[PDB]
Symmetry: C2
Subunit: 331 residues, 2 copies
């Protein structure tokens, strides 16, 4: 029996960090943790308090089930943050509430979410991390909360989200009688790209970018259409541009990371494999852990075509540091 | 073996019909034919004159090859019109004036022909990604392109095979084909089952496989130069044509009165909305692509069926498999009459 859910958190209204989130990283882990409220729901069935979660629907992923279950039980649409853990079978993510307007832009991309009935949930509360430890009914949830605290101590509360998307399956260079720039994705590629939208939607992507080359454009265009977020073309990220000026490519990419951190919005960018490889050559060594760096590979099966990697980043004096990596596959 | 091509035609410059195509239908068949010009190409290898045509590429439809080959050899991009015929003759025959059948062992060539009309450079540019690339033939393949009257075509065509096809073009014209306009009806792609979808019927989307289906269909629909796009506002229909809309930059016009609910409630209103599209298609002389729900299509067909020019055509006008499977389309060529729109040709359009 598969289920998914998570710990939805926010900065306590009135706290210094809430008044200006940008100062979060200039605060200690304790100052941050003391400024956080987490969401706990009450199930009348067992008269218990726990983290919102629920069973996956038929052919639905755990990440999608998690966002849906949180919305159904807390009434809050959210975007997934770093992954927390799994319990013997439920997977948990820490997550942040998104605006009602943003949620509306994801209606078709994510799919429907129905409010739970009073017989499923009859109370929703927002408490501090200390109180959460006190009121949670099951030890399992307290453990997950402890993992949540670890993440915060490791800077997760200040992390921002960058989604890197490899273009979907495209026509072979062998049979394509056009230019490489207009080489399109194949019918199967369109299916993969289409199916991937519901997954990418779990991270509330509100800034879309892409190499101008058709195969990359077509990979995110339906998402762009449903979310009404125009795709920004980044000419300096084509394979030709990367081959000629790789450092200029890093600047282009790095600027998107800067925009992501400043706006605190999720950025999704469709890129070419060798270009992603070049980006990773610099990000690998900046990862928070060796385990993360080992996964940061722009090749299959680490990252097959039509799939993405949801990266959570904090900036450091040495460069952007990835604190978590989630491989995102369609269907 | 497999090839495709066609007779690309236009109204002679300076002629009355040319100065105002709208008057074409008020002219006799003989008046139309005498004011028409058809395109013939010269091949240096055979030093012959024939209709443009060429071998289908791997995984290409005959219809797509027809448009591409015409484009490669005549240099002008076109939109397919009514279908003409198919021919077959031994490969050894090709340079001979009169094509003769051979025995079972001989290698043969099978060619499908359509009548077609040139489209503007701008429209062609809008179809670049939807149709795909088209390069020009080299002087070693084609080294002259002429436009002649139907009478002269009969006199300069090097092969009997092409003269037979021209006779079919004549038959088609004599039946209104030169005045016909193109409406493409598109059934939405495979969609989520009503039982598993937990949203509204309005928002039920197509499946990833449906999306592949719709995407592949684009290069086929592109053969008819669709410049007007319409759809039921329901998501499953919108998503069936949105990639085409995106590529061609032609907005998708929502027609609320064509949803399944609207049709069930007011079927006559559905016909009016549908008929208004036919009116627009005929007046603009542009191809309209409209995505609809199966039952609503059946409802349109119940009226169109009896107006078909041939009973053979009426029998094919069925809104359901195997006649019209999900995710496929029907390209209709229509001429309007005092009793209502009359279909003179039907072409089933499927992907892959």
């Amino acid at each position: 029996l598969e289920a998914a859910g998570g710990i939805v958190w926010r900065w306590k209204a009135g706290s210094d960090i809430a008044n200006d989130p940008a100062i979060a990283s200039s605060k200690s882990a304790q100052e941050q943790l003391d400024s956080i409220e987490v969401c706990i729901v009450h199930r009348p069935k067992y008269d218990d308090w726990s983290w919102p979660k629920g069973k996956l629907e038929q052919n639905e992923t755990h990440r999608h089930a998690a966002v849906r279950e949180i919305g159904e039980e807390t009434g809050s649409p959210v975007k997934l943050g770093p992954y927390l853990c799994e319990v013997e079978h439920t997977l948990y993510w820490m997550a942040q509430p998104i605006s009602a307007d943003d949620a509306e832009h994801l209606l078709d991309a994510f799919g429907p979410v129905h409010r739970a009935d009073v017989g499923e949930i009859n109370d929703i509360v927002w408490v501090s991390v200390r109180e959460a430890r006190k009121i949670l009914s099951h030890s399992t949830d307290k453990d997950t909360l402890a993992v949540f605290v670890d993440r915060v101590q490791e800077g997760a509360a200040t992390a921002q989200n960058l989604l890197i998307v490899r273009h979907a399956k495209a026509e072979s260079r062998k049979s394509w009688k056009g230019t490489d720039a207009n080489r399109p994705i194949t019918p199967k590629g369109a299916a993969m790209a289409f199916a991937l939208n519901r997954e990418l939607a779990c991270f509330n992507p509100t800034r879309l970018a892409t190499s101008p080359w058709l195969r990359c454009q077509e990979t995110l265009q339906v998402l762009s259409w449903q979310t009404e977020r125009p795709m920004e073309h980044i000419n300096t990220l084509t394979e030709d541009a990367f081959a000629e000026h790789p450092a200029v490519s890093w600047l282009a990419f790095r600027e998107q990371i800067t925009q992501t951190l400043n706006s605190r919005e999720t950025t999704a960018i469709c890129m070419h494999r060798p270009v992603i490889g070049g980006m990773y050559d610099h990000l690998r060594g900046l990862c928070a852990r060796k385990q993360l760096a080992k996964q940061l590979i722009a090749k299959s099966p680490y990252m097959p075509t039509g799939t993405a990697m949801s990266l959570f980043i904090i900036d450091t004096p040495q460069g952007p540091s990835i604190i978590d990596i989630q491989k995102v596959s369609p269907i």
